[PDB]
Curated annotation (Swiss-Prot), chain A:
Locations listed in the record: Cytoplasm; Nucleus
Positions annotated to bind ATP: 16-23
Role of this protein: Component of the 26S proteasome, a multiprotein complex involved in the ATP-dependent degradation of ubiquitinated proteins. This complex plays a key role in the maintenance of protein homeostasis by removing misfolded or damaged proteins, which could impair cellular functions, and by removing proteins whose functions are no longer required. Therefore, the proteasome participates in numerous cellular processes, including cell cycle progression, apoptosis, or DNA damage repair.
Record PTM N6-acetyllysine, positions in chain: 48
Gene (UniProt): Psmc5
Subunit structure and binding partners: Component of the 19S proteasome regulatory particle complex. The 26S proteasome consists of a 20S core particle (CP) and two 19S regulatory subunits (RP). The regulatory particle is made of a lid composed of 9 subunits, a base containing 6 ATPases including PSMC5 and few additional components. Component of a complex with USP49 and RUVBL1. Interacts with PRPF19. Interacts with TRIM5. Interacts with NDC80. Interacts with PAAF1. Interacts, in vitro, with the thyroid hormone receptor (in a thyroid hormone T3-dependent manner) and with retinoid X receptor (RXR). Interacts with ERCC6.
Entry protein name: 26S proteasome regulatory subunit 8
Recorded family membership: Belongs to the AAA ATPase family.
Residues represented out of the complete protein: 175 to 232 of 406
Highest taxon, organism lineage: Eukaryota
UniProtKB/Swiss-Prot annotation, chain C:
Protein name, per record: 26S proteasome regulatory subunit 7
GO CC term, one of those recorded: proteasome regulatory particle, base subcomplex
Gene3D superfamilies named in the record: 1.10.8.60, Nucleic acid-binding proteins (2.40.50.140), P-loop containing nucleotide triphosphate hydrolases (3.40.50.300)
InterPro entries membership: 26S_Proteasome_ATPase, AAA+_ATPase, AAA_lid_3, ATPase_AAA_core, ATPase_AAA_CS, NA-bd_OB-fold, P-loop_NTPase, PRS7-like_OB
Modified residues (N6-acetyllysine): 79, 385
Subunit comment: Component of the 19S proteasome regulatory particle complex. The 26S proteasome consists of a 20S core particle (CP) and two 19S regulatory subunits (RP). The regulatory particle is made of a lid composed of 9 subunits, a base containing 6 ATPases including PSMC2 and few additional components. Interacts with NDC80 and SQSTM1. Interacts with PAAF1. Interacts with TRIM5.
Physiological role: Component of the 26S proteasome, a multiprotein complex involved in the ATP-dependent degradation of ubiquitinated proteins. This complex plays a key role in the maintenance of protein homeostasis by removing misfolded or damaged proteins, which could impair cellular functions, and by removing proteins whose functions are no longer required. Therefore, the proteasome participates in numerous cellular processes, including cell cycle progression, apoptosis, or DNA damage repair.
PANTHER family, per the entry: 26S PROTEASOME REGULATORY SUBUNIT
Organism name: Rattus norvegicus
Cellular localisation: Cytoplasm
Gene label: Psmc2
Curated annotation (Swiss-Prot), chain D:
Glycosylated residues in this chain: 136
InterPro entries for the chain: Ntn_hydrolases_N, Proteasome_alpha, Proteasome_alpha-type, Proteasome_asu_N, Proteasome_sua/b
Protein name: Proteasome subunit alpha type-7
Assembly and binders: The 26S proteasome consists of a 20S proteasome core and two 19S regulatory subunits. The 20S proteasome core is a barrel-shaped complex made of 28 subunits that are arranged in four stacked rings. The two outer rings are each formed by seven alpha subunits, and the two inner rings are formed by seven beta subunits. The proteolytic activity is exerted by three beta-subunits PSMB5, PSMB6 and PSMB7. PSMA7 interacts directly with the PSMG1-PSMG2 heterodimer which promotes 20S proteasome assembly. Interacts with HIF1A. Interacts with RAB7A. Interacts with PRKN. Interacts with ABL1 and ABL2.
Gene this protein is translated from: Psma7
Protein's organism: Rattus norvegicus (Rat)
Family to which this protein belongs: Belongs to the peptidase T1A family.
One GO term describing the cellular component: proteasome core complex
CDD domains in UniProt: proteasome_alpha_type_7 (cd03755)
GO MF annotation, one: identical protein binding
From Swiss-Prot, chain F:
Family to which the UniProt record says this protein belongs: Belongs to the AAA ATPase family.
Binding residues annotated for ATP, in chain numbering: 26-33
Species: Rattus norvegicus (Rat)
Quaternary structure, from the entry: Component of the 19S proteasome regulatory particle complex. The 26S proteasome consists of a 20S core particle (CP) and two 19S regulatory subunits (RP). The regulatory particle is made of a lid composed of 9 subunits, a base containing 6 ATPases including PSMC4 and few additional components. Interacts with NR1I3. Interacts with PAAF1. Interacts with TRIM5. Interacts with ZFAND1.
Superkingdom of the organism of origin: Eukaryota
Protein task: Component of the 26S proteasome, a multiprotein complex involved in the ATP-dependent degradation of ubiquitinated proteins. This complex plays a key role in the maintenance of protein homeostasis by removing misfolded or damaged proteins, which could impair cellular functions, and by removing proteins whose functions are no longer required. Therefore, the proteasome participates in numerous cellular processes, including cell cycle progression, apoptosis, or DNA damage repair.
Cellular compartments annotated: Cytoplasm; Nucleus
Protein name: 26S proteasome regulatory subunit 6B
């Protein structure tokens, strides 16, 4: 993509029902990549860093 | 001019040579620095020893004492140690304390936080200046406000006005409002701090105005500066109802930015370029003339402006005769700069689906449909026209 | 000359190599010593090092109950919130430590050497504070009708309480300054502050709100008291909808954290005591959020509205601003102001600023007619619609 | 029926909110130009976005209020102003136009109809529960001595006689440019009046000579609405003449 | 950043306009046809007997989750265990779907998804 | 719940994968805990009842340490059931995380998740 001369999508929205297994597959892309799974909900689910990662953009 | 350079140099030669000359020579001859000079080096080094607890200097008290709050869970009203100076401990900096008995041995660290790291954003953009075509007038307006007093403040403060600050970027979204701040920023060579307006309201209680202070304070220290505040429109539009800080949070944040901007503070060299959708959807507290001298309203981009932007993207893209610029521009209506960017980015992506590393007239024609719908869509408008 | 030039480049490396020797002798980095004041202080300093006066741990004394085993003891609660019973180190008398007063105790040996200065626990509030600021007197419009009304209440008791007692008039308390953003509540307050020449602490309430409910409240009472003690203090409370908002709850939210602090401010101004002669000014962003306790005379004797500066005011702001500026004098400064629609004070000034910029842009020693016309036609259309005032004024 | 609380109220901004929104909504629009001839007085609009799957019938911005009076409206805006809004101002003027036409024995005084137009858009601003329209109109007609007129109103009702006036795309921008275009030797025959209307419209039109819609009106004969195919022939002649000039 | 959202309304205007977000992806509600394959893979985990009735069981459930699909298989094991079979039979799946179906209906009446 | 405890061998064999945790959901009073209570009484064993406010201690640092040992007892003497009465006051999706008090709850949840895979 850097070669073609584009700028790579920042954002990806998946949308539809939460019980057509859309959610299950979304997470399956994370298992398949071996990405670290950082979950942010705009609530402090257990995230430790300063103690939130929902103010943590940069 | 040249003669001046010799004078400035004159202070500096004496500063390095004197410090070198005095330390070694004076311990050697009579008793001037001598026993006293060793004594300061040694005492501080022994007291400091192993370990040292880190603390932060909250305040300095005038009676050879200070309020340090230590990173061990206990605060201290320390006593100064012999041969350490009270008045070299900055309120910006954290100080090091001997951890056996609490006294300031010294400052080896100023320490660093993740809080700093948000304000400081480094830019080295793919599109910059002379990668934007058309809407030539709009760039000149920005510069008279931001660039000219920032470079040479001397007349502007001197005449009697406070320097004209900033610009407000509103009109049809997509004109290329974001490209413009980043591009003008390189030309002036101002330190570019980017912070979102929605990021300032967050779960934490009382952290919200403190962060806004930091944003301004850091911009000022950096020296020439522009603060591009992206999506500031966000505080106003939404009463979020998802923050534990609540409606209280939104109130207190909104005031602090005003305070830090001018206020009674009246900080200088800090231009704010505000990106908004519209300033009719923006919060009425924030908006008010006379903090931002000039407001620019972009017109709807025409067919003409559009060609110049596309020639640049064609140069950045794979080169062929199968790139057909004109056709895509013509078909579309009087609509944003963003679309020219969107047609090019979707066209490359589209190619990958095929199992082709080519971007041809076919990828473009498919791209024209999706970009046009998403952005505003012509088939509603055709009836009303 | 050529020799001299070489040194410019060089000095930077030369300071870096030398840097461990600089650090020890002058200060910062390895072995921080200033050499000028800690040297002088050194003989006094030796007393403190020898003693357990380091540590001298942050605390406040709850009660000075003395008891047996070691006779001079005090019951202290530290600022992190746990109590210790401590001893007296001989260097002060039991008289010096007093109940409710801030005190220092050791951590290694719990005992008082010197009591810690009371009530200076906010650092956050101090951050904002600049004593006696003002952009310049010329942007104000100088003496307006608005400025003069403000001086009678504000300047006059601080400068002379003598004249007050002589005539036999009670001294005033509160002035409530109100209007939507940019009508200059803060600008006028700074101008009177400088004139009276009383010490000036302005503070934003948004830093006297911090952490959770009740910590911000401690900051407001201690600050206020401290100022009250101080003879001839002027406090300009800048923009309070952050210790000044509405009072309610609905039990899906709640304004509480804000109301705890607001109420703490209101209580303190006159007090349950007669009144002092130390002045409070409040600047509020809404006249629609105020509860009646704040409004009572003796915590607010006359209400002054600085909202959308008066008919006289619009022209004075342009001419006094114009006076300072290098501008053309064949244009009527009042005509430009008059054109301005329902002008907030910030908006009148916006014309001058935009007008001057065009003039600076040319680099002339005046300005021209053209600079003024483009500025003013632009201001009337766009800016006025986009002011603070259309939205706020209807609400208020 | 009408709203109990007023849409338009005097608030501090200098005018009024709905006037203020309304000036924005004809500024951001497309070009509608009207040139005053000495044969026919001709109006034309930049956009209708014609593409050959649809036909204009009443879809026209230009609608004749009267046998010799017609007005072309530019409700037209950032995202397009409302044909719905224009039609009300049209309905009310047309009945009034015909009543005056009945009363005067020679072609209806434009003057009456434009003054009238101005009051119709103002009365909504004072009326409870209502607001003014976001149109600008080119009221055209011939007097009772046969004097051709091209008049303009803005959204709140203010009126002037003009030789030629252009609105939308910044109203000030386009109208100062129509003075340059305008010639008095270029209005002497029916095709030359029509050529001056079209030259201002070409400037930034998307797919021109199809979107361009202009109608002609005669001395007391009804409006003749020109189809875009017929208009295209003139558009070609000028678009080449214009190229030649640069 | 992967965001999952359940509407086209949760989005903000910045997310809609292209130049940073290439494409937005939509998933259909659970189909009968797709249901057969998700179910087939889970049915492999246990023994089957002569005759295909995977289609019959897929058609009957209206679903509401991947959980519901997965539950048909687990449930067939619970019925076989009670009964003390040493294999899983075709008859068990029939009883299971029907059980699972009924549980779905109770959630449907209450206006609930799979979380209460 | 009851049968894999008795005969793990039949429960694995059948085609249902080895025992994993159960989540019980519903509106208040429906007897999510009631069916769990009932079965535990009949058995007399293979059940560890832990209160979710027993994870927590007064004194900091100990609170996650408790969780590991109790959860471990189950693993050695497997199959065994760890039953938490009310999982809430710990299962918060929001922590303040600025006071020591908030931090401690956040540490119990953090241990819990880790331990769940551990069983």
């Amino acid at each position: 993509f850097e070669a073609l001369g584009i700028a790579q999508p920042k954002g990806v929205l998946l949308y539809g029902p939460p019980g057509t297994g859309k959610t299950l597959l979304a997470r399956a892309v994370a298992h398949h990549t071996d990405c670290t799974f950082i979950r942010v909900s705009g609530s402090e689910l257990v995230q430790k860093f300063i103690g939130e990662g929902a103010r943590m953009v940069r | 001019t040249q003669c001046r350079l010799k004078l400035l140099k004159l202070e500096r030669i004496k500063d390095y040579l004197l410090m070198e000359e005095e330390f070694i020579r004076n311990q050697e001859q009579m008793k001037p620095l001598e026993e006293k000079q060793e004594e300061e080096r040694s005492k501080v080094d022994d007291l400091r020893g192993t370990p040292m607890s880190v603390g932060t200097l909250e305040e300095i008290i005038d009676d050879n004492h200070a309020i340090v709050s230590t990173s061990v869970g206990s605060e201290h009203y320390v006593s100064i140690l012999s041969f350490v100076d009270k008045d070299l401990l900055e309120p910006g900096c954290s100080v090091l304390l001997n951890h056996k008995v609490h006294a300031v041995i010294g400052v080896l660290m100023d320490d660093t936080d993740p809080l700093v790291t948000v304000m400081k954003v480094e830019k080295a953009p793919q599109e910059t200046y002379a990668d934007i075509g058309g809407l030539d007038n709009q760039i000149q307006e920005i510069k008279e406000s931001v660039e000219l007093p920032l470079t040479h403040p001397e007349y502007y403060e001197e005449m009697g006005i406070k320097p004209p600050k900033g610009v407000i970027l509103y009109g049809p979204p997509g004109t290329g409002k974001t490209l413009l701040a980043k591009a003008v920023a390189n030309q002036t060579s101002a330190t570019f701090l980017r912070v979102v307006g929605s990021e300032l309201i967050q779960k934490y209680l009382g952290d919200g105005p403190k962060l806004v202070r930091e944003l301004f304070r850091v911009a000022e220290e950096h020296a020439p500066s522009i603060v591009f505040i992206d999506e500031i429109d966000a505080i106003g539009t939404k009463r979020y109802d998802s923050n534990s800080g609540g409606e209280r949070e939104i109130q207190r944040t909104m005031l602090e930015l005003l305070n830090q901007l001018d206020g009674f503070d009246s900080r200088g060299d800090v231009k704010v370029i505000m990106a908004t959708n519209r300033i009719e959807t923006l919060d009425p507290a924030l908006i008010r003339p006379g903090r931002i001298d000039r407001k620019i309203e972009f017109p709807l981009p025409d067919e003409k402006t559009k060609k110049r932007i596309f020639q640049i993207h064609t140069s950045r893209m794979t080169l062929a005769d199968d790139v057909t610029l004109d056709d895509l521009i013509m078909a579309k209506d009087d609509l944003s700069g963003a679309d020219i960017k969107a047609i090019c980015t979707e066209a490359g992506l589209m190619a990958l689906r095929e199992r082709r590393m080519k971007v041809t007239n076919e990828d473009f024609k498919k791209s024209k449909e999706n970009v046009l719908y998403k952005k505003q869509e012509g088939t509603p408008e055709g009836l009303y026209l | 000359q050529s020799t001299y030039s070489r040194q410019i480049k060089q000095v930077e490396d030369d300071i870096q190599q030398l840097l461990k020797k600089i650090n020890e002798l002058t200060g910062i980095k390895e072995s921080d010593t200033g050499l000028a004041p800690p040297a002088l202080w050194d003989l006094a300093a030796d007393k403190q090092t020898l003693q357990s006066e380091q540590p001298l741990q942050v605390a406040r004394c709850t009660k000075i109950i003395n008891a047996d085993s070691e006779d001079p003891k005090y019951i202290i609660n530290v600022k992190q919130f746990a109590k210790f019973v401590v001893d007296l180190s001989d260097q002060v008398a039991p008289t010096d430590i007093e109940e409710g007063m801030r005190v220092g105790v050791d951590r290694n040996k719990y005992q008082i050497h010197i009591p810690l200065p009371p009530k200076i626990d906010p650092t956050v509030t101090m951050m904002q504070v600049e004593e006696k600021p003002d952009v310049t007197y010329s942007d104000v419009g100088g003496c307006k009708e608005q400025i003069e009304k403000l001086r009678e209440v504000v300047e006059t008791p601080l400068l002379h309480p003598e004249r007050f007692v002589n005539l036999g008039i009670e001294p005033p308390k509160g002035v409530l300054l109100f209007g939507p953003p940019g009508t200059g509540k803060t600008l006028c307050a700074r101008a009177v502050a400088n004139r009276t020449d009383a010490c000036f602490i302005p503070v934003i309430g948004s830093e006297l709100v911090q952490k959770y409910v009740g910590e911000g409240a401690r900051m407001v009472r201690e600050l206020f008291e401290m100022a009250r003690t101080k003879k001839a203090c002027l406090i300009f409370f800048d923009e309070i909808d952050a210790i000044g908002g509405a009072r309610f709850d609905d039990g899906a939210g709640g304004d509480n954290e804000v109301q705890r602090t607001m109420l703490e401010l209101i209580n303190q101004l006159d007090g349950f005591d007669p009144r002092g002669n130390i002045k409070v000014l409040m600047a509020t962003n809404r006249p629609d959020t105020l509860d009646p306790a704040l409004m009572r005379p003796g915590r607010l004797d006359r209400k002054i509205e600085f909202s959308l500066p008066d008919l006289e005011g619009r022209t004075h702001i342009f001419k006094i601003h114009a006076r300072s500026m290098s501008v053309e004098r064949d244009i009527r400064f009042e005509l430009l102001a008059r054109l301005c629609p329902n002008s907030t004070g910030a908006e009148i000034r916006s014309v001058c600023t935009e007008a001057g910029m065009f003039a600076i842009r040319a680099r002339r020693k005046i300005a021209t007619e053209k600079d003024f016309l483009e500025a003013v036609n632009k201001v009337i259309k766009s800016y006025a619609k986009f002011s603070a005032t259309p939205r706020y004024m209807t609400y208020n | 029926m009408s709203y109990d609380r007023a849409i338009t109220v005097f608030s501090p901004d200098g005018h009024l909110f709905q006037v203020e929104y309304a000036q924005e909504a004809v500024k951001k629009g497309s070009t509608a130009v009207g040139v005053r001839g000495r044969d026919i007085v001709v109006l034309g609009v930049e956009k209708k976005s014609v593409a050959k799957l649809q036909d204009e019938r009443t879809v026209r911005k230009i609608c004749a209020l009267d046998d010799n009076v017609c007005m072309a409206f530019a409700v037209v805006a950032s995202v397009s102003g409302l044909t719905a809004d224009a039609r009300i101002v049209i309905n009310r003027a047309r009945v009034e136009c015909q009543s005056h036409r009945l009363t005067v024995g020679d072609p209806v005084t434009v003057e009456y109809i434009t003054r009238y137009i101005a009051s119709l858009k103002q009365r909504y601003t004072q009326s409870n529960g209502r607001r003014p329209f976001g149109i600008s109109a080119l009221i055209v007609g011939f007097d009772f001595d046969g004097t051709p007129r091209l008049y303009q109103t803005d959204p709140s009702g203010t009126y002037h006689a003009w030789k030629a006036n252009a609105i939308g795309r910044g109203a000030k921008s386009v109208r100062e440019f129509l003075e340059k275009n305008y010639t008095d030797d270029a209005i002497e025959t029916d095709d030359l009046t029509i050529k001056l209307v079209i030259k201002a419209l070409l400037e930034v039109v998307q797919s021109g000579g199809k979107n361009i819609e202009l109608a002609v009106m005669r001395r007391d004969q009804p409006l003749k609405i020109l189809s875009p195919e017929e208009i295209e022939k003139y558009v070609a002649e000028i678009e080449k003449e214009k190229e030649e000039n640069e | 950043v992967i965001m999952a959202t359940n509407r086209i309304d949760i989005l903000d205007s910045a997310l809609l306009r292209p130049g940073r977000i290439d494409r937005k992806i939509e998933f259909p509600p659970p189909n009968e046809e797709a249901r057969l394959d998700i179910l087939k893979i889970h049915s492999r985990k246990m023994n089957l007997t002569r005759g295909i009735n995977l289609r019959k069981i897929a058609e009957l459930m209206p679903g509401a989750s991947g959980a519901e699909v997965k539950g048909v298989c687990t449930e067939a094991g619970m019925y076989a265990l009670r009964e003390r079979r040493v294999h899983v039979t075709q008859e068990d799946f029939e009883m299971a779907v029907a059980k699972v179906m009924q549980k779905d209906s109770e959630k449907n009446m209450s206006i609930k998804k799979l979380w209460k | 719940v009851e049968l894999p405890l008795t005969h793990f061998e039949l429960y694995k064999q059948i085609g249902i994968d080895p025992p994993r945790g159960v989540l019980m959901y519903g509106p208040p009073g429906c007897g999510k805990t009631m069916l769990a209570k009932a079965v535990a009484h009949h058995t007399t064993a293979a059940f560890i009842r832990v209160v979710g406010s027993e994870f927590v201690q007064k004194y900091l640092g100990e609170g996650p340490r408790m969780v590991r040992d109790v959860f471990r007892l189950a693993k050695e003497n497997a199959p065994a059931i760890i039953f938490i009465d009310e999982i809430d006051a710990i299962a918060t999706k929001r922590f303040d995380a600025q006071t020591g008090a908030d931090r401690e709850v956040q540490r119990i949840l953090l241990e819990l998740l880790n331990q769940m895979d551990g069983f």
